[PDB]
Structure formats: structure tokens, C-alpha cells
Design a protein around this nucleic acid. Sequence first.
RNA 1: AAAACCCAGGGAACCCACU
DNA 2: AGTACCTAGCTTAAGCCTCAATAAAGCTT
DNA 3: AAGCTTTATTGAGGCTTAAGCAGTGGGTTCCAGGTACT
Lengths: 82, 171, 48, 248, 128, 493, 123
Amino acid sequence: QANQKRITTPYMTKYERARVLGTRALQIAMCAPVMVELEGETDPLLIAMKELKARKIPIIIRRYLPDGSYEDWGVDELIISD
Amino acid sequence: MFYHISLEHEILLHPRYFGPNLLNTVKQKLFTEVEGTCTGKYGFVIAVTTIDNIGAGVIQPGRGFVLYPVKYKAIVFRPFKGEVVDAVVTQVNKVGLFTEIGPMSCFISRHSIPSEMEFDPNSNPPCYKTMDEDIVIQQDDEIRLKIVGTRVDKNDIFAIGSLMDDYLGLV
Amino acid sequence: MEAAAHGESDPMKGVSENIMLGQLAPAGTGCFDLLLDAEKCKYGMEIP
Amino acid sequence: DGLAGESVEFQNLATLKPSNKAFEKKFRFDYTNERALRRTLQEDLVKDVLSNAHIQNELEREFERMREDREVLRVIFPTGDSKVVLPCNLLRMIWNAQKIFHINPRLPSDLHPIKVVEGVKELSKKLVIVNGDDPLSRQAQENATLLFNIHLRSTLCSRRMAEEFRLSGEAFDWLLGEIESKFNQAIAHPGEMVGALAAQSLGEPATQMTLNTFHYAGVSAKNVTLGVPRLKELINISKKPKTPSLTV
Amino acid sequence: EEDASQLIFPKEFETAETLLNSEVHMLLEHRKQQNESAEDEQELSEVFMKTLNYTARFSRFKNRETIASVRSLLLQKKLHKFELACLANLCPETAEESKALIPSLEGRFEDEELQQILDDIQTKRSFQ
Amino acid sequence: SACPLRTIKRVQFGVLSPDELKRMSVTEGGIKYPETTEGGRPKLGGLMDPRQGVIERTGRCQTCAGNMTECPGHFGHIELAKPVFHVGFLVKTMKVLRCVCFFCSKLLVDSNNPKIKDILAKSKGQPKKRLTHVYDLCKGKNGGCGRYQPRIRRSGLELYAEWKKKILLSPERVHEIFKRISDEECFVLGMEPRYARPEWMIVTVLPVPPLSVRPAVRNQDDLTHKLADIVKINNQLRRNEQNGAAAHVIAEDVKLLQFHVATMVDNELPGLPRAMQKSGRPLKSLKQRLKGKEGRVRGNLMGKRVDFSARTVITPDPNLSIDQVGVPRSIAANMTFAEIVTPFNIDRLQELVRRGNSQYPGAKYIIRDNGDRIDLRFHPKPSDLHLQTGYKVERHMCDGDIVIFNRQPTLHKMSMMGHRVRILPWSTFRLNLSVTTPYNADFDGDEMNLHLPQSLETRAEIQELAMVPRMIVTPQSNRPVMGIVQDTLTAVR
Amino acid sequence: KHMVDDKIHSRARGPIQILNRQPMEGRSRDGGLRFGEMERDCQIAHGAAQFLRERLFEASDPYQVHVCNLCGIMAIANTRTHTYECRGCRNKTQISLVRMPYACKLLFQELMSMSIAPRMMSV
RNA sequence: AAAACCCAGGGAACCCACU
DNA sequence: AGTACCTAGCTTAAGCCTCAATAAAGCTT
DNA sequence: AAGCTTTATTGAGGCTTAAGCAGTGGGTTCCAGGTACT
Ligand SMILES: [Mg+2]
Ligand SMILES: [Zn+2]
Ligand SMILES: [Zn+2]
Ligand SMILES: [Zn+2]
């Protein structure tokens, strides 16, 4: 489905944000390049939250429609809940 | 036969090797991990022609790396049963005949070699020849062999040739 | 047994199938899948 | 309705349980009176309402919707009660807006009532439960927010806005943004385990509510049976209940 | 189970496409050239240059234009990809030799037409 | 390791084909010896078979190269002499026998019938409902062979046919008559022959589970004792029909063998004596191992023991936030979190490694890049204590760590919260006061359970979902559940 | 008599049961806590699927087994010689690896002991 | 004899406590 | 004699037992 | 032959039977005995 037929909710709901944070902090902890300029942090979860507030997570989320179809929303494209 | 087919393989990327250029890393990974490999179903993976499609990267739940399904044109070769193929002789033995087809070593045993084509270690090169000394198959010759069967062991295939049928031997 | 006697299958689209099989269930934080962006990885700098 | 159970509050439907004259007195926004308009609105806005008749027609039309809404609520709620749960606490946010912008409601207000009607209609379009444009989705969207829109119109009518609330133009703009933002936060999140949440939502109170609170007579003659056994008879469909009954 | 002498192939190699020794040689030479460039890349596998030398030694068509001429000449006759590739690679000179090396050519074409095809192959064979 | 990692999209349940069971079996000759071991070494073909699995630690499998941990176990088969129908499928067997013709082995229903085509039209994907419609349709017939409906009654366990003559019906008779039903004939009854065939329901070869199922500790399992009875009686039948052929000892030992194999699957036959051992305790059958609340599905698959968990009495503490829990040092000095070595924390983690275990803030396990663990409580040579980016360090939990904090019984979703770890000296769980109300824990000797998310990804999952500030308001009654405890409430009033 | 030092206990990958590769029971044998059925239900309600998987598989009894792709039965695998064959099928090439708890593997095993085939298909 | 005890290989039933 | 070898209530579907319309079978006028 | 009577007949009301019945720790006892043969 193209962007014309993009029917899921534009807001990043809490499960998606919770999993994105975990899977991004896991990557950062494993020496992944950091997308945002950190001001000095050791905890990778804080770095992932900083990226979330910066909307620069290099993850596209695949929302599976119950019929079998799926949409691909960008993290920067999703409106953050908080 | 030398084949040009499309093969699907999954490449695994750790976040440590994401980098600014990500797809080039995947291309290098594919160009390293399948090249020179051999499968029992598709034979020798000779070369990858062109990386056709890069699939969506599914991050494995819980574990860190991402997964890339990749379709790519690849040059391959797999030995068959019953075909005459050109070969280079690598060693002549009293028990058999060591021949080469690209990267594949082929063993042509003497019982599968006709009675006229006898072995002589008295020659300076140990070679196969007849009593008339017309057909002399020795080291580094260009011959044709009849592939009877192939055996795969330790992820590579070696075959057995024969010279029973007509027009088999030195070119 | 009755499923085995009738040759039944199981799509495992529920929750407890994945739980007993030990794989991730589609029950929130797992109802979806994540794809690594290609373009956004270019815009990020390497940390020292 | 598609609304999660965390971001809702008990609210009172003002459209329900007035008299017909009381409903008209409190919501019609009689524009014919001079002095009332002078006290509530600024003079530039007062002459704007009095001169134009198109604005008067629109103010009459929205009141027509309220009478239509008033009949709908009475059909929905045959019992004379209005304690209903809704996501956005409109009365509190209006009171929140009043303190933020330092209304001093003694002075006449300065927002055009046509902005209130237009702002509400635009806000109702922005609150979307069901996407799409086909009439099937339009009816679903209308039915999903039918109760909320009726409450939204009732609290944000032109009469109460100019008489008992008296917000400012910037305050009203902030109010619309706040209502829209809070309503979107109350949308049910795709992926919530509703089945598990609902099952625990019923089984948790089952521990506290007595096995035999009905040991006493309850109805003087009937033996109500309310308790764990009555809960049990509903959870499993029991063809032989302990005390079947009718209400003739 | 498989026998290409009567064209018995597995279901996997149904959409497969064949290649010449010279086509493989030129493709591998281009890949070796790009390996010479594009630094920070290690050498290719042993099978790579093994097959490269194998197909360079047995190369018969020294020109890519010769390759194109051979394909435009051979594709329009009713030949299977395996038979066509084997004929263009082994390069027989007599129709009896062509039929003996490839026993699946029995009756596919007239022996006079088959000999004419072999003569065309010998005409377009890049001699050394 | 060469096998690609995959996930189970679907699982299909079917009966094991006797021919399939024979070929998948590793005991090629079959279990023919009731003995367990021969002269102190496992007897091939006995109850304990080396091919079947690994016997003891520091050993290898003879089928695979398992190390008693990577060896999943390998099944064996028992080719018993006379075929036997086993319990459970007997009720389904009886229904199939009714539907099929006793003599002609026909569908008995004349599928060339718009009624059945209506049933087949209605039954697209439901096998059990398809078999029901037909069972009701089967009714009584005697239809083609004539007088071919013998009422099939089940006395005790053995089922006997009875016309209006009654004879106990042989299991091999059932196997012979199910051999004739065709493929589409089975599909009418709702069994796919590719997956479930009626002739397979009669167990003509009994699978013996590997050593991973029944353990040995010298000491045999209850299942082993029953399998001893199976092969002891099986050998008796095999030798009785080989030369004896008394036609009466067979008539009784087949029933005895039928009883033993039936009880091995299901112990508590309602009308049949429970099987017994020499100790006097009833043997636990496979069905009894699964049906109970302490069985496998509930007692092991649904709810199971978990590592990285602590349990001690809780004591109130008002000097810490609602999202903080005060865990003891000894619990924190025994509970570890797997932290990834990165250049940001490589110096801090190196400082923790040189401290080692028993130096509270330190660590006990260090994991290499290849999954090799090195202990730290035993003081290895400083040479392998170096750290580069990629290693794992299981360090003792420090302040700020996230834990899951729950009380049995967990009624609602606020009975299980995520808290931040604070280290306090004494040996109790100091938690805040307002957390009492959701937990319903009044410190009157109440002891609490604390779980630690080991992965980093799940740590963020709890922190974004299970933190107590994020569930102050309940979904069940859209109201807060934290509230103010009594002493603060009276004092603030 | 209910003092706290008799009741306090923690655990990290301690001793493991022999019948199934799950933790022991009771602090006397350095046992671990049981994440019972209601705990699983509560973690479903929380929607913390990854944490539930961690608790029930990674932190309790991680295990891996080789199954061939054609028939859903576990095969024989010599990880030393990298020989992966399914007896009965003898494919030796279309075989897959899955990560599933040891309790589930055991359960499937006595299910096979009941002549029931839990054929696992990864396709 | 890497005696890397890198630290259980027993189970079953019953009773008693605590929530 | 010491030891190795043999042998309390519940509920609900569910199968089973009995009983009244009804059309085929054969008389009946 | 249309109707009455009989006789299977067939679907529709009444009786037994499995099968389930909340969560974690601590102690105690018991698991062959009986014959047989040197
Ligand atoms: Mg208490
Ligand atoms: Zn093994
Ligand atoms: Zn019949
Ligand atoms: Zn297989």
C-alpha cells in the first residue's frame, strides 16, 4: 500500500515506542553509530531516549494489518506520544 | 554446467558494522560469504554477477543484528551425470587418473579406462598410452571425460570420469 | 489427541502458542516488526 | 468507541435533565436583548451580531442541533441520570483555561460567538476515530463520537461561553488545541491486550465482593443471590440457576 | 535421477540460463578488474581464479562481438539452452561428432542443417 | 549450527504412522530385552539403550555427538507381536467403527448423497464437526452386506461387537478393517490420510521415549518400570505364538499386554485396576504427567521456575520514591545484569572486573565474544581479565537498575510493577507506602518476589511500560490506585 | 519463628533440575522463584511480550533443537562433524534450527511417545 | 586424570506452617 | 548366614433407554 | 381404491460419567520381600 492508502494511526503508541527504545538501546550498546550528538552519557537507554526526542531513529516500523497487509511507518514520520 | 541463476540468501549485519554506508557492507558480506562455496543442490558457487534485490531488514526480536534477504544473479557450476566435459590432467596413476575441471578434482579409475589405454611409469612422466603410442594422455593434457557420478564431501563435490564410450580421451 | 486424531493444524496466531514454543508472541510490543532504515543510517556520525 | 479506559473521567451532561424552558433559557443565546449583549461582549462584537442576520441564522441552527441532540440523549438514556465517562474533562479544562489567561470574568468577553460555533465544528472534524471518506466510515465516525460531540457542543455552546465562561480569543484557541490533544491521547492503542485487561478488570473485584453478601434477605422476599455464586452462574452459562426470577 | 543426455533436469534448474566459457571469462575478468579497484577489499576465493584460468585456457571466442554474433545466430533455431551452450562450447566439426557428444540432438535438426550450423560455428570460431 | 535459525509458523498434530515410527526409530532391532543393563554396561535393545540417548554426565551419545545437554534424545520402537488399540483413541476408534461398514469396510453412508454433499459443503476445515454429522447420520443400517451392523459395545476397556452373536473383537481385526478405507473415504469422516489415518490409531508398534524423558539416577523411572512390563509381556507373546500357539495363553496375555500399554498412556482407567509397582505407589502415566495442574503444560510450560529472582520479607519505608525499592546487599551481591562492553563504560566495567566477586559493586561472570564464560569468584589469572568492545559483563546490580516486583496472588496488572533499585543495608525489601494499595501487602510477614530483566531491550520495555508512575490510574475503573496510606492520610488531614 | 534471614534468598543461574532443565524448588537447594500462570497473564496484560519471552525462555530454560523442514520431527545432529540428518527422511539438506524451551521439547517428546506427531513446520 | 567439584543429578507420598 | 537372582459435592455434555406420529403393507368391503 | 388398521420407525424427552477445583518454603517417611541355594 502506498502513502495515499496509509490508514493506521499516525501516533506512535506506547508498545511501539517501548520496543523501539529497547531495540535501539541494544544497538547503541553494541557499538552502533549514534544518530544524535550526545552531551556525554554512559547508559545507552538514555541515548535512545535522546534520539527519540530528536526523532532520528533509523528504524522503519512494519505495522501488520489484520487482513495480511502491512504498512511501513518511519519513526520520524510517526508522531511521538510524549 | 556453467549456469547464470538467481539465488536467495540472508545476510546478517551487526549494529557495530552499520556505518554511514550500509548497503556496501552488505554487498561485501555477500561477495565474501558465498564466493568459493559449494552446495549439494546448486553445486559450485562460482561468482555473483549482480546483487539484484535487497529485502526489508527484519531486526531479530531480542537479539541485536538485522536480517537482509538478498536476491542476486550468480554464476554457478554443478557437475552432472552423463556428460562429456573438457578437463586438464593433473596426475596419471596406476590406480586411476587425476583430472581437473575448474576447481573440481575428478578421479578416473583404470578399471573404468579401456584396456588399450595402459599405464607406464617407465616414461619420464608417468602417463597413460597405448601400445601404438598414438594416444598419450600425460601431465597437463587437454582431454575429454565421461562423468559417471559425483560425490560431495566437506562441502565440495568431486566426480568420477570414464572412457568407455566413443570419442573419449585426448583431444 | 483429538486434534492428532483429526489431523488438525495450528496457525499459532494466538498468544500462548508462542509462549509454550518460547518464541515472541504478537501481544503488544511484538504485534509488529521493525525494519532498519537505510537512508537515516547515512545521516548519523560515528562516535569516537 | 475506541477510547482507552485510562484517560476518561466521570462527567455530567448538561443537555440532559433540564426543563424545555430551562434548556432554552440556558442554551439559546438570545441575541435580541441589547443590554445582555452589552455586558457579555465587547461593543464591536455586539453590533456585529446585531447587524448581521447570517450570524443570527447560524446561532439558531446550532441550537437546532442541540434540540436534536437533546432528543437523542433522552433516547439513549431513558433513566434521568447523566453521570457518564468521557475522555476529555471539558469543564476542568475551561476552568484551567480561565486561570491560565487571567479572565477576570466581570469584564465583557472578547471572542466572537461565530468563532465558537466554527471552532467546535472544525474540532469535531479533527476528532477522528474511524478514517476514510465513504459513508460507511462516516457513519462509524459519527457514531463513535456521537456522545462526545453532543457533550462537546453542550459545554462549548455560544450562550454558556459568553455568559458563564467568558473565555478570550487566545484562551479559546488554546482550549481547542488542548481538547484535540487530550482526545488523541485517549485513543485505544493498537496492540493493547484488551482481553487480558478486561478479564483481570472483572476478576480483581471478584476477590473483594463477598461470597455470601446475600446471606441476608436482600430484597425482603426474593433472595437476590448476588455474590460469587451469582457471578459464577453468569461466567458459565448455567441452565439451572440457584434462583431464577422475572421482573414483570 | 538427472540425465542431460536426454535433457532430464531438476525442477530447480528450469528457469536457469546458460553461459559460454568466453562469456564467463569476460565476466570474471571484469570482476577481477573491479576487485583491482575498490580498495579495502580482500582477494576473491580460490574457485574464482581457478575457474577464471580454466575458462581462459578453453576460450574459443576472443571477441564480445563474436559472442553476440554467435548468440544472434544460434538463438532462432529450436535448441535447448543446454544443447546450444554445449554446441557453442565443445565446437564439434562433424555432424556425427555433434550427435555423439550430445545424444539429445538426435532428430532435432536435419544432419545437413546440423553440419551447416557446425560449419558456421567453425567460421565464427576465433582462431589462435 | 549450520542449520538456519527459524521460527515455528504452524504446528500440525497427527498420529505417528507405524511405518514412520519404525524408520525414525534408532533402536533398529527394537526393544527385545526386559533387562535394564547387562553386566554394568547398557544393553543394546534393552530398556536403557546407548543409541537411545546419553546415560551419564561426561559422556557422549552413540547416535549423535550429544554431551548430555545438547543431546535431545532419540526414540526407540517396540514391534509388539499382536496389534493393540490403546486408550484415548478407543472412543474415537468406536465412532469410526460405527461409521464404517463392519464387513465390506465401506463408508456405510453412501456418500453419493446430497445430504452428505451438504455436510461436506458445511464442513470445510472442521474435521471433528464433519465426523459428528456422519456419526449421527450413521444411525443403524445393515445396508449392503446385510445384517452388517453389530452394536459395538465397550465392556470395561475391551470393546466387543454384538449382533441381534456377541464376540470380543480383536485389535488386529480393527487394523485389518481400517486398512481398506480409501483416501477420500477418510476425508468424508474428517481424517486426512496424509496426517491421520484410522489404521494408524491401532498401535502396532509402541514408541519408547528417549532417556531425556525418563531419567536415571542406579535408580529407574516409573515410566521405565512400565516399559519393562511392556517388553517382558511382549517377549512372552512373541515366544508363545512362535512355537506354543496355545490359542488360550494368547487369549489372556494379549489382554494383559493390552492393559499394560493402555495404562502406560493413561493410568486412571475408570473401571480397571490402577497399575502397581513393588513400592506400593501407583505409577504416573504419560497422561497423568500432563493433565495435572503440576503437569507439563501448566506446571512447566505456562508457569515455570525462573532464574534471576529474589524473595524476602518487605518492610515499609517512607524515605524513598514510589518507583524505588530497597533491596538488600546480599541479594544485590548475588543478582547480576548482563552489561555490554562499550567504550563508554569500558573503564567502569574494567574497575568492576578487578574488584571481582564478593566486592559488592563488582561482577562474577565475564562472557567472551564467542559465548565463553569466565568466572570471577575464583580469581583467574589477570591476563584474561582484559576487556575489549563486545564482551559481556554480568555485574552485580547497582542503584538505578530496573526490577519487576510482584505479589502472589497477582490479581490485576498493578500487582506486578517495575521499580528502580536502591541499595540499603538490612535484609528486606524496603518499598514505599503508596505502593501498598495496588499490592495489598500489609507488611504482616508478607514476602515479595523480585524479578530482574536480564536483557537490555527488556529493561527498556519495563521502563516504558511497567514503571509505577505509568499505572497510577487503573483501566478497570478509570481511577487512581496508589492513593495515600493511612498514617500520611490522617496526618495530612 | 518467622524471621527474615530464614526467608531471604536470591538466585542467578543456580542448580538446574534433571527431569527438565528448569531451576530447582526451595531456597534450601538454591531454588528459583516460579513465574506462575497468573504472572504470565499479568505480563500479557502489561503487553510486555519481550519480558515475558525473556522470563519464560531465556531466564528459565533456553534450548535449541534441529528439525528437518519436510517432516516436523526433530532430527539427529552431530555438531562436531556438522552432519545434520533426519532418519526416515534422509534429506540432510533441508533442516532447520529452532530455539525452543527444554520443557517444550520434552513435552513434544512424550507426545511422540503417545504416538502423536507435533509436526513443526518453519515454512 | 583439563581430580575446571566452572560447586546438587535422587525421586515419590504425607504433614506443618505463611499469604 | 550372606548375597545374588527372580517376581464432598456440583455441573454438563454424552451415551443409553423408552414412547408416541406415520407411511408402507395388507386386508376390507 | 380411498380409507382404516397395523408395524416398523424415527425423531424427540429422561438417566450415568468424567473433570475440572489460586499461589511458595520446611519437615518426615518410604522406596523388596521371599524363597533358594551353598
Ligand atoms: Mg499479609
Ligand atoms: Zn543423542
Ligand atoms: Zn459393506
Ligand atoms: Zn525428515
